[PDB]
Amino acid sequence: SGEYTEIALPFSYDGAGEYYWKTDQFSTDPNDWSRYVNSWNLDLLEINGTDYTNVWVAQHQIPAASDGYWYIHYKSGVSWGHVEIK
């Protein structure tokens, strides 16, 4: 998969299939532990070329791209597979 679209927060994705998406609404603040990605059923989740599928990661933890936004990648294998971003 490839060629990202913009998304809006809070975000959620479901159902067997493979994707990219982008955003710039991600908080940068060192206080913002309550804003995160987390996954359990997904075969893959990467953000700017680091894998997090079996864990959680906060938006404030990740540096932006040079053009000023974050890249997110997802893969699902199942009809019950879902994910959530704050």
Residue 35's φ and ψ, nearest 5 degrees, are -115, 110
Q: What is the dihedral of CA 67, 8, 4, 33, to 10 degrees?
A: 70
Do 53 and 37 meet the contact criterion of CB atoms below 8 Å apart? no
The method of structure determination was NMR
Instruction: Compute the distance between CA of residue 41 and CA of residue 38 in angstroms, rounded to an integer.
Output: 10
Q: Where exactly are the structural domains of the chain?
A: 1-86
The DSSP string of 8-37 is: -SSEEEESSEEEEEEES-----TT-TTSEE
Instruction: Compute the distance between CA of residue 39 and CA of residue 47 in angstroms, rounded to an integer.
Output: 12
Do 1 and 19 meet the contact criterion of CB atoms below 8 Å apart? yes
